[PDB]
Ligand binder design. Structure first.
Ligand SMILES: CCCCCCCCCCCCCC(=O)SCCNC(=O)CCNC(=O)[C@H](O)C(C)(C)COP(=O)(O)OP(=O)(O)OC[C@H]1O[C@@H](n2cnc3c(N)ncnc32)[C@H](O)[C@@H]1OP(=O)(O)O
Length: 411
């Protein structure tokens, strides 16, 4: 029973989603004038707050909320510790809408108690290729193509309720108020991800992890000894030896991305992402924002061949707090971001990502099996994680697809 989600324009069961064969909206069309102009009522001791993401004080307040209260593993050993610089990056892409960043604070002391953030994204989200095949074989190509134009929608992230206020139905009102503010902008769909099962994902991908410092990872109980290494008398030693990375990048033309690479990176990324059912459309401004290197936040490298950029990869940094370990209190994790390989095998491109991440002191490289990420798991010695990242739409019926048809990276 979902007292909240059963009232919302989402598919309500896996059985329902299994039957969806076209993309399209779920709610009746509405207009902005149908949407209340007043923020939803909230307890008189709390207030809605829209942070100013240019104010160091406001960014710091969000930072501290998430540091102490955002996603935790089930054993409370690790918690994400997004940096202030990362939050300003993730929350403030080009043309972002300040009113889509929704917070609740306590009036008396102005303490931040809850947060949810929406940013604009332009998403291809029309009927998937294989369902269009089946639709065309039914003479319904027209209906299957109705919504192929990229849509300007909302990407939701960073939903967080302070630990002391959990299970008091604050998340539904936060979500409802964000929806109100987005709808008041004439935007009617959103996309979000979660590591938990909600009604009802259109895609789910397993997490995979590449140890860069396997001794540390075993000590902090992030990962175990892979089953294939349990046959050894000293598995950690063999792990270190087989996981040892080349001292140097295998691609001699590798260098950090620079502003003049933006147009070529845009073109090769968009050409690659076009082959996926669900994916973002990025302008030069958005390519610049999301991919140009930013210290401690995002790292992007290009390969030149024949004087031109032919390949690139990116990763971003999310440290996690390690709780209860007497030897370590932080885990430095690199997350595979966007990439495109036009002249070298993808596993050779991503090997250079691992080499660079190791040289920069990261402990582990994490990814979800979206894009073509599954294809280099075995080759580059990634191990399967316990987690799955689920992909969801708000007010968009969508057929179930494999994660290999998803090209939207979530931060
Ligand atoms: C058109 C524009 C639309 C824009 C909006 C689109 C939708 C966006 C949707 C949000 C996308 C977020 C994407 C991310 O950021 S996913 C990461 C979410 N954050 C965390 O896990 C951080 C740590 N946990 C917390 O802060 C709290 O436990 C949260 C805030 C998660 C729940 O707070 P609390 O534990 O105090 O519970 P409650 O009593 O207030 O509320 C219980 C209700 O909340 C439903 N619930 C539980 N977990 C989630 C979840 N992860 N997404 C959506 N709904 C969730 C649950 O099914 C129940 O509804 P129902 O089962 O009774 O019906």
């Amino acid at each position: 029973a979902h007292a909240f989600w059963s009232t919302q324009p989402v598919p309500q069961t896996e059985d329902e989603t299994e039957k969806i064969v076209f993309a399209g909206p779920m709610d009746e069309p509405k207009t902005v004038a149908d949407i209340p102009e007043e923020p939803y009522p909230i307890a008189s001791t709390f207030e809605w707050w829209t942070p100013n993401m240019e104010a160091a004080d406001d960014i710091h307040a969000i930072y501290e909320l998430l540091r102490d209260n955002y996603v935790e593993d089930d054993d409370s050993m690790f918690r994400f510790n997004y940096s202030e610089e990362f939050l300003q990056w993730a929350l403030c892409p080009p043309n972002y809408i300040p009113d889509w960043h929704v917070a609740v604070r306590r009036k008396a002391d102005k303490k931040l108690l809850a947060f949810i953030a929406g940013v604009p994204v332009t998403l291809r989200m029309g009927t998937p290729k294989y369902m269009k095949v089946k639709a065309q074989e039914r003479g319904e190509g027209e209906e299957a193509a109705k919504y192929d134009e990229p849509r300007h929608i909302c990407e939701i992230n960073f939903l967080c309720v302070h630990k002391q206020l959990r299970e008091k139905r604050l998340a539904p009102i936060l979500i409802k108020e964000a929806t109100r503010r987005v709808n008041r902008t004439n935007v009617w769909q959103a996309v979000y991800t979660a590591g938990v099962l909600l009604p009802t994902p259109y895609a789910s991908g397993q997490y995979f992890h590449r140890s860069l410092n396997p001794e540390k990872l075993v000590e902090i109980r992030f990962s175990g000894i892979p089953a294939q290494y349990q046959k050894f008398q000293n598995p950690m030693a063999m792990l270190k030896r087989n996981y040892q990375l080349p001292s140097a990048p295998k691609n001699s033309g590798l260098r950090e991305m620079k502003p003049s690479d933006v147009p070529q990176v845009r073109r090769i990324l968009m050409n690659y992402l076009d082959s996926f059912d669900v994916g973002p459309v990025f302008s030069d401004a958005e390519i610049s924002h999301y991919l140009l290197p930013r210290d401690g936040v995002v790292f992007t490298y290009v390969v030149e061949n024949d004087k031109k950029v032919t390949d690139f990869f990116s990763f971003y940094r999310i440290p996690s707090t390690v709780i209860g370990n007497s030897n370590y209190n932080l885990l430095n994790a690199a997350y595979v971001h966007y990439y495109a390989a036009t002249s070298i095998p993808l596993h050779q491109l991503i090997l250079d990502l691992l080499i660079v991440a190791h040289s920069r002191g990261f402990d582990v490289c994490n990814m979800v099996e979206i894009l073509d990420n599954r294809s280099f798991v075995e080759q580059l010695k990634f191990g399967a994680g316990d987690g799955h990242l689920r992909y969801y739409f708000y007010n968009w019926a969508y057929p179930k697809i494999k994660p290999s048809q998803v090209a939207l990276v979530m931060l």
